[PDB]
A paper describes a structure:
There have been increased efforts recently to “drug” RNA using orally bioavailable, low-molecular-weight compounds. This study combines two of the most powerful tools of modern drug discovery, high-throughput screening and structure-based design, to target the theophylline aptamer, a tertiary-structured RNA that binds theophylline with high affinity and selectivity. That structure revealed how multiple interdependent components of the RNA form a well-defined ligand binding pocket that enables theophylline to bind with submicromolar affinity while excluding closely related compounds such as caffeine (which differs by a single methyl group) by more than 10,000-fold. Previous biophysical and modeling studies have shown that the aptamer undergoes a large conformational rearrangement upon binding theophylline. X-ray crystal structures were determined for the aptamer, both in isolation and in complex with various ligands, revealing the molecular basis for ligand binding.
The first involved replacing the GAAA tetraloop of the aptamer with an AAACA pentaloop, whereby the pentaloop structure is tightly bound by the antigen-binding fragment (Fab) of an antibody that is cocrystallized with the RNA. The apo-crystal was soaked with the aptamer ligand TAL2, and the structure of the complex was solved at 2.46 Å resolution. The electron density for the RNA remained lower than that for the Fab but was sufficient to reveal that a large conformational change had occurred upon ligand binding, forming the binding pocket. However, the ligand could not be precisely placed. Thus, to reveal atomic-level details of the RNA–ligand interaction, it was necessary to turn to the second crystallization strategy, with the stabilized aptamer stem and no protein component.
Author numbering:
A (entry chain B): 4 to 226
B (entry chain A): 2 to 150, 153 to 214
Amino acid sequence: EVQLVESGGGLVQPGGSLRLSCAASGFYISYSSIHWVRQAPGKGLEWVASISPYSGSTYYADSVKGRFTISADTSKNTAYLQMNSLRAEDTAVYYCARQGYRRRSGRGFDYWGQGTLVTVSSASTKGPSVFPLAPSSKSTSGGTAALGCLVKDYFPEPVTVSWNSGALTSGVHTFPAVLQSSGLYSLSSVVTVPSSSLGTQTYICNVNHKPSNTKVDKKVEPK
Amino acid sequence: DIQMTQSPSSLSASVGDRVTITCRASQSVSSAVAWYQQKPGKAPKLLIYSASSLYSGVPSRFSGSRSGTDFTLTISSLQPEDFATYYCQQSYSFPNTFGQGTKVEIKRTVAAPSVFIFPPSDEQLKSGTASVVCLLNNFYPREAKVQWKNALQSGNSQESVTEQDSKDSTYSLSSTLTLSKADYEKHKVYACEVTHQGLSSPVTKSFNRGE
RNA sequence: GGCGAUACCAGCGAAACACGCCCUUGGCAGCGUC
């Protein structure tokens, strides 16, 4: 049906430039208004820009006016957001949104995309170091044990941490990343398991950091 | 530009509670106000448009009203699928502006935290840095005090809290103490102290360097 | 009531602007003419 696929996000220095795309499927953008809305990590939605059908008129927020350019290519069924003079303030997930048809939904934004992550910083890409969180309860306690992994000092976001290659999801907790004073991110992933499975069940944390092409699997068993 | 002041910024309510979220415009926006529902890690979804018109596929528990420049979104009774953040947005004039959002969380009985302490990792001490991790598994509410074990440390600890679990409505917390490995081997017993409402007394989990 | 223009705000055309439509209305407008 209707789909919005944003691309072009990444990591850039302050003052750099980026060009985001929004590929539309299931409808033709020449009959609708296309909006861009961004969301900083842990904050609210912020309207960025929009383009109107038939006339191609464009509108911008005060925080991006002069630095951004929204446009469309109806032959490609794709909208674009040119980003220039980027500041750290522009670090956010950038959503693409279709304004619905006036008769059925008014001026509401009835369809959104998954978003693309734009990081504006002078910090260089760095991969994380991974260390285990050894389980506390032993193999024959009769209760529950907590184990995990600590991946530390990485930039930029994001990472993905799985356990047993996605086979273990009950009781897992991958904590949001915190920013250390060194400027690099760090988080922990834990899981509670029955003590009767220690020694017979295999536990591996799979950490994935695509921005740096870093792949690590670290084993977690009773120390 | 038209400012959208939304209130409250967050609430905790139980299933079956009638809630009304208020979004007030700084100037006349007619009725060109919509509401969106955003669940952690997902894309927003349209709920109602034109201040009071329900969008297709959205249950009848959602309603909206206008009183001049005032706009309220009302869920008649909370249900176990409505945990999310809600935003108001005006489309009367450009630039379109969103409200600050309202975080809707689920009220539930008090749950005590299960505490675990993890010593620094033998692979990590090789790197010259130390990191002790205290874990506070599944509790309610988010309010918890973690203090590091013996002068009490200050300024060298960071905390992180998960979102509300969609099943048991609990929270989890981590705390990491750094310093250096040289400092790590000059002290002996390490312990994290946690205070929680579901705890009659502060609970301290510790370990001896040497198993 | 009769005859002809005039599209301000709404509504409508896949349509916030531009383009187009709808003429006492969709608003208990207002200027010409019997």
